[PDB]
From TrEMBL, chain D:
It comes from the Bacteria. This is TnsB. The chain holds residues 488 to 542 of 584 of the full protein.
TrEMBL record, chains E, F:
Zn(2+) binds at residues 110, 113. The keyword Metal-binding applies. ATP 2 binds at residues 13, 16, 44-50, 140, 155, 167, 171, 227, 231. This is TnsC. Mg(2+) 2 binds at residues 49, 126. It comes from the Bacteria. ADP 1 binds at residues 13, 16, 45-46, 48-49. ADP 2 binds at residues 13, 16, 45-50, 227-228. ATP 3 binds at residues 13, 16, 44-50, 140, 155, 171, 227, 231. ATP 1 binds at residues 13, 16, 44-50, 140, 155, 167, 171, 224, 227, 231. ATP 4 binds at residues 13, 16, 44-50, 140, 155, 171, 224, 227. ATP 6 binds at residues 16, 44-45, 47, 49, 140, 171, 227.
Amino acid sequence: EVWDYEQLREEYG
Amino acid sequence: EVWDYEQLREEYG
Amino acid sequence: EAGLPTVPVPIPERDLDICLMKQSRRTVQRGGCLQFQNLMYRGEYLAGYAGETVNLRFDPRDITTILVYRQENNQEVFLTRAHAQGLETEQLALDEA
Amino acid sequence: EAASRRLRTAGKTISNQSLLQEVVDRDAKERQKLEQTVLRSAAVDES
Amino acid sequence: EWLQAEIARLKGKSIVPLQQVKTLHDWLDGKRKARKSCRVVGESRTGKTVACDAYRYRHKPQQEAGRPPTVPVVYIRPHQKCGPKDLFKKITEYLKYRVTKGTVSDFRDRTIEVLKGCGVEMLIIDEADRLKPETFADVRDIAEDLGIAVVLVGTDRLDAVIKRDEQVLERFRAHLRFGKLSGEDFKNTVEMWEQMVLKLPVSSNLKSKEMLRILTSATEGYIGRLDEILREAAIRSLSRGLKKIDKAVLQEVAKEY
Amino acid sequence: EWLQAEIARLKGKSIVPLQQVKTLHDWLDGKRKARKSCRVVGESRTGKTVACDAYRYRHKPQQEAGRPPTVPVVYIRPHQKCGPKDLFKKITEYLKYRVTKGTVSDFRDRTIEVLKGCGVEMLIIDEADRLKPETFADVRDIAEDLGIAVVLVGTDRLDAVIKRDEQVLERFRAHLRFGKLSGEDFKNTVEMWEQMVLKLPVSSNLKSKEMLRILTSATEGYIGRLDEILREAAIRSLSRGLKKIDKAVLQEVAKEY
DNA sequence: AGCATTGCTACGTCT
Ligand SMILES: Nc1ncnc2c1ncn2[C@@H]1O[C@H](COP(=O)(O)OP(=O)(O)OP(=O)(O)O)[C@@H](O)[C@H]1O
Ligand SMILES: Nc1ncnc2c1ncn2[C@@H]1O[C@H](COP(=O)(O)OP(=O)(O)OP(=O)(O)O)[C@@H](O)[C@H]1O
Ligand SMILES: [Mg+2]
Ligand SMILES: [Mg+2]
C-alpha cells in the first residue's frame, strides 16, 4: 500500500 | 509504608 | 632449550597475580574495615584485630579487591581478601580512581 | 587576559579595580617570568 | 480487565521515603525553624523536586474558620524568565488569592500583605534559575523584610546564575547537595522499587546482582532513571503477557538509554 | 495526454510502509502508553519526518458531538528560532483554536487548557533543534505537568542542543535512531520503489545486482536519495518517450551528484 | 592530651 499527502490531508484532516 | 502521590494530595487537601 | 641448567618449574598463573604491587606502613582500622587511596574497604577477618600496621596487595587493573597480609612471627602471612564498601555491581581500576 | 580567565574560577566580578587587585600582588620564579624580565631588562637602557 | 488498570497505575507517579528525602526534610525543618534562607542543588533527576514536593504535603496548610489559611510552607516553580509580577502572582495564587490587574507595586504590596497573615515561614522556589536577574531583588527583600526562609532549588545552572550577583550568592551560601547513589543504598532502592512500586504479581528478583549490574550501568545512580526504566519495563512485560520483569525485557529497555 | 498526468504524480510525494516506519510506530505506541518523553534521531533524509507524519495520520483527531476534538497525537514543526509564544501558537492552532492577542502568560495558560480536554497524550516536535534554548523549559513543563509523552525529532544537530542543557538531556535520554539502509533491506526497498511507487509502464527489474552499484553510489542508503533518483529518471524517461528507466537514464541522473 | 596515618607536591633523575 502507498498513500498521497493530498489524500491524507482530506482523509485524516 | 507506601505513600501514593495522590494520597499525599488527599492528605494535603 | 638445551642451555637451561635444568627444567624449570611452571608456576601457577595466580601466583604471579599474587605477586601484585603492595603497600606498607599502612594500618588496619579497629574494625572490619579498611582504606586505600581515599577508597574505603571491608574485610571478613579484620575484626579479630585492633588497629595495627598492615601490608596489602592489589591489582592496579582491578582495585575492586585487595589481598591483606600480616607479619606473623616476622613473616608475611595472609589476613584476608577484602573489598570496597558495597562495591560488587561494577569493577574499578586504580589509574581512573 | 590570563587573570580574566582564572579570576572567574573565584566567581569574582571582573572590573578595573578587581583586575588591578589581581595585579598588585603578582610578586607572590618560572621560565616565562625569567624570559620577560630579562627581555624587558635589555631595552630599558634606551634614552 | 486486569491490564489497563495496572498499566494506568504504573503510568502514574509515586513517592518513596528515601534517605535523601528524609535528610532534606530534617534540613528544611532546621532552616524553617531558623528562618534561614538557603539553596538545594544537585544534578537532574536526583529527586530534588519530589523531595521538596513531599515536604509541602507533610506541612500542609491549616484552616481556621473565616480566616485565610495558615500556610507555613509555600512551594512555587516559576515559569521561564519569571519577572516580579509573575513571581508575585505565583505566591498570591498559591495562598488562594486572585490577583487584580495593577502595577508591580500593587502586586508586590498585595503579596507582602498575604505572606503575612497566611503566616508563611518558608518559600521554596523550585528551578530558581528561571528567575530574571531583577526579580532576585524581590526574592531577597521577601527574605530580609519578612521572617521567611527562602529555599532556592536547582541544578548547577542555579549556582551559575547566583554567582553573577554578589548579593544573591552571599544570602544563599548555606546549601545542601543532592547526590547520585550507588552500591548498598542503590541495591536497597532497587529492592524498594520492586517491593513497593512495581507491585507486579510475580517477583522480578531485581535484587539479583546481575540485574543490579545492568541497572547500575543504565540508571547511573539517578533515581529518575531507575524509576523510568522499571516502569517502562513493567508496561512492556505486562503487555507481552508476562507476569514478571526479566532481563529479556529489562535489557531491551536498558539499551534504549 | 497521458505523459503530463504521470509527471503530475511523479513530481509529487508519497508514503511507503517501510519496516523502519513500522518499527517507529511500535516504539511510539509504547512511549504513548508510558507517557515516556523521548527522542527520534538519525541523519538527514532518513525518513524520520515521513514516519512521524504517518503516525499522526493513523492516530487522527476523533470528533465528539459538540466537544473539542480528541487529539491523541499532536505533531508540530517549529519555525526557526521558535520562542515560547511561537510554540504555544502552533500547538493551539493545531488543535483548531484561534490564538488571541495576549502575553506569553496568556498563551501558556490557554495552551495548557487546550492540551487538556483535547486529551493530548503525545506531542511530537519535529526539527526540535529549532526551539530556542529558553523554550525547552516550557516543553519540559508540558511533559511533567501533564501526562504527555513529548517526542523530540532531529538529526545529531539536536543532540548538541540537548546536551547543552542537562535538564533536557536527562528528560529525553531514551531514543531511537533511524539508520541508513543496506543490503537485502535496501534491495527490498529498491524493489518496492519499482513495483509500488513508480508503477511505470515497462519494468526496469531493479533487483538487478549490478545497477544496484549505481544506486548505492548516488544513494548511500538514504531513502530520501533513493526516492529522489527514481522520480528524476522516470520523469526523464516518460519525457523522452522511454517506457522504462534505462541504464542510460539512471546513470545520467545518478551523475548529477 | 598527645601525635599518628593518609593522600598530594615538589625536585630531581633517569630513560
Ligand atoms: N523519592 C522519590 N520517590 C519516588 N520517585 C522518585 C523519587 N525521587 C525521584 N523520583 C522519580 O524520579 C523523577 C525525577 O525526580 P524529580 O522530579 O524530583 O527530580 P529533580 O531533581 O527535581 O529534577 P530536575 O532538576 O531535572 O528538575 C520523578 O518524577 C520520579 O519519577
Ligand atoms: N517512507 C517513505 N515513503 C516515501 N517517501 C519517503 C519515505 N521516507 C522518506 N521519503 C522521501 O525522502 C524524503 C526524506 O524523508 P523525510 O523528510 O521524512 O526525512 P527526515 O529524516 O525527517 O529529514 P530531515 O532530517 O532532513 O528533515 C521525503 O521528503 C520523501 O521524498
Ligand atoms: Mg526537578
Ligand atoms: Mg525532518
